[PDB]
Symmetry: C7
Subunit: 188 residues, 7 copies
């Protein structure tokens, strides 16, 4: 991370209301991104925010932490898929303000059902199964709302890894526009 004069590159971008997510989503990442979101919203609750997304996914709770925040602050959060928006990453992509969900020409998106683990007594394994099946329904329901796709379709399309091109993601309703030029973005 190079320094700008003193800011680290990411911090310099943060200054222009730009948040970069380019790693898997774990508690730390959500924690950092949530603080950044709250900070900006405090700075100016009216000014829009840009969240770049390039991650393989991660913890469902970490993602919902980021998700609920994006929706909770007044600022509208624009999402840009760069590289790959997989699993919870793709979910955050579609979580962006309607009409402000972008991706780049060669961007990729991948949706699929939650993954988990259960170990121990039958009673414990059942508790885990029940919980992960519930999380899948919640996620699916929210995804159907974001994309405009029927719940039944999300369910069926997420059974196994579903990789999509930037065009397909548009077609599916995961993003609103594919950015090509430095002017295609509404920012300028």
């Amino acid at each position: 991370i190079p320094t700008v004069i003193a800011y680290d590159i990411y911090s310099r971008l943060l200054k222009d209301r730009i948040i970069m997510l380019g790693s898997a989503i774990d508690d730390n990442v959500a924690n950092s991104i949530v603080s950044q979101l709250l900070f900006l919203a405090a700075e100016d609750p009216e000014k829009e925010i840009s969240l770049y997304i390039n991650s393989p996914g991660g913890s469902i709770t970490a993602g919902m932490a980021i998700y609920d925040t994006m929706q909770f602050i007044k600022p509208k959060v624009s999402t840009i898929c760069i590289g790959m928006a997989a699993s919870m990453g793709a979910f955050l992509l579609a979580a962006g303000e309607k009409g402000k969900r972008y991706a780049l020409p060669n961007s990729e998106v991948m949706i699929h059902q939650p993954l988990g683990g259960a170990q121990g007594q039958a009673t414990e394994i059942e508790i885990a199964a029940k919980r992960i099946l519930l999380l899948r329904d919640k996620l699916n329901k929210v995804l159907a709302e974001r994309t405009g796709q029927p719940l039944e379709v999300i369910e069926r399309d997420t059974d196994r890894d579903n990789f999509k091109s930037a065009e397909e993601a548009l077609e599916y309703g995961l993003i609103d526009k594919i950015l090509t030029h430095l002017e295609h973005h509404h920012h300028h």
Copy 2:
């Protein structure tokens, strides 16, 4: 964690009386959390403090350190569940000023009984067993007073991992309100 000119993202939020508990609770974390609280209470014993919670919990003793400090200082501590508030995290979530305990739409909460270990001679195992059971009952008593539930209900509901949605947590008495809009908070 990015910087803020020269601060640290969390130090930045700290400046606005916001502490972020976003990791497993251990002696380290407890000491940082307690210090931040003591600091803020010194800065202004009148203004309230907001403690965001997103952790899988941890040490009972570390937790109570945070718990006692919360009730100790003059400032009223408001809790906010983001992502997941499990085990001691949930205990702490419910420890915020009555009426100022929050969670976001998709936040999750989980309560369960203490976990521990014992090794050695029968005598030592019994000393340890007596300690954990006693801690369990102590925690149950505080959780009951906090939620309003009857002790016997808390005892049975924590036998196994008990996962709750923000609405279930609200209806249980773990939190007071589910934030949805930036102005749904009592602050803004």
Copy 3:
């Protein structure tokens, strides 16, 4: 640990004559605490000092370095138990200035006999045994005086891990008062 404005949360508290012990006690930790105590004593040998204790204890020699420095300097050292004060931690807690040894409602204190080990020749094993038995007697005598309990009692009550609640510690004479309010301390 976050920063304050430049500072460190602990560094910031140190400015208010507050030292935080929240880990196992080893040489490193002891040197830090001691240097902090000497530094504060150099600043104003007349001003009081608050030492927060949340520690499972550790090295006996390391703890005595802290102990001796506490008594050595002019400032009166007040101890406050947070979470857990076990073995040497409990000794340090009881070591605070008579009348200024506090604990919080849910704090725990654990007293027990010294732990150690020895390997090698019978002669070597006897040297260690002789020593650990002597340290225990030295420690027991100090504790008895600091608590008011008769030596015989300290001896029998430490044969095995003895966990005590804030109330029991008060009763045992390990602490002077249990805190709950912000202005009920010696500072107000």
Copy 4:
């Protein structure tokens, strides 16, 4: 990396709109380079940018994130191959603004087909197989266009590791010119 009183050598060069890519390409490297590009573009959308490349390659999604950002910003991104530009490194080199894709005299370039893996059920291995074969076409089509070589020539030529000298890279269409002098660069 040495300092420049107070900058980081790489940070100092970033000031002159120079970005050094000198390691394998992963999500970290891509997030840093993409951020540097955005920053520069934000600094002055009119000025050019130099991207020095010397890397063994890396993640395809990480590289495309860099690729898409290069075309996406208004500024022209000139690429200079130094040492070795392999795998996604060569891809990126060829992605520079046409006419401004350079290589020093003894530079090396290596192109080859993607690499990956798959474990699991036939259905899952099929999905992974289809994806990788698809990414291969996608990249091959971009390289075909950037270089002017027909798709199937790119396919056959990248079947096994293909090492090209600077003269061969020029001939192939990967670079526009082999630099020798400092001022010989279109820039100065």
Copy 5:
């Protein structure tokens, strides 16, 4: 280690001519202690210096570098045993300026003969044997001179680990006084 506002806690004490030695003794620690002694000497060759000691000792050559430097520089070096001063650590404690060698009430001191190793041919083991026997004898001669005890007695007393309280240390001649109050120190 906390900071003091731009200094390190130890650097702050260094400003008051106080050097802390609270870790095993190796080349590193020695290089730092010597450097500090030299610095303090250049600053004011007339002002006294205090060396707090709490270490299990360590390398002999390292310890002697510190020993010789203490004698070499003009400032009188006062030593204060805190916690434990064993092996080379005890040796350095006894090396303080006569009449200014201290220990706190519950400090501990341990003396013993050198430890070492040897691998290889007979000739090689003999060389090492002679060296360590020589080192032991050298150290014993200094301890004798410093304590006032006869050489024969130092030899017999260090055959095996020999632990002593502060009183026993005083009565043996390893220290000159046991400090109790912040006023018992020759300083104030």
Copy 6:
């Protein structure tokens, strides 16, 4: 690395247009060296640069990146061998400005053929074989040009490790002068 007030020792020397290369040559080292050369050339493309070389060698491509950059920039680059210049290190040494390639009295240089490895199918092993045999031939031609030795001599002399004294390095044509005094350098 110590500091000079506030640069780090290498930064301080970088200010006098002196670059230090005292480690094995890998992409990371190459990237730092190249960036230093570029920075200096940007600072003042007229003044000469001094490159101190003490390294066992390393990556051929990492070395060539440095090689090319040296020739690439406007500033003439003087090389000085201290300790040892082996393999690619010796190569860089010889790559210094003609007449300005130095070595100290007891400096050591070594030349040998490239090292590498191959694993996998015969086809893949052939690709690796042809490439290392090509690189060797490429390096050999540059060494011949830089030393004045006929290719055939360079080929036979690099078959096995070939260590040379500073004087032998001079007679071979690897360097031009053997420094002894502070003025024997063309700078003074």
Copy 7:
């Protein structure tokens, strides 16, 4: 390493033309030592420099880099042995300016023949043997000139680890004077 005020203890000493070598000699160390030497010589080629030495030795080539640089620069480099100077460390001690090679009362010096390895074909074992033997001879020739002993005696006396007291080192011609007081130093 503590800080002196904006300065690292060693850095503070470097200001007074004092370089501390208290570790094994590897490429890193040599690089840092050579740089500090060049720096000091650039700062003022007239003022002498003091190189303290407490090191087990290490790489021969790294050692010679330091050696050649000490002789090379104009400033006279005084060496002071503290603790132990072995292998290349003793070589460097003996390398100081004639008449300015010191040692402290209990300092120790050790000389031995080079150590190395060799694996592979008989031809390569031979290349390695000749070199190790060549290096031994080169080093013994330099040590002889600087000590006054004939090569023949230097070789014999280093066949095996040869530990010498400060007094023995003086008589052998490795040092010129054994310092005792801070006045017996020509600088003071």
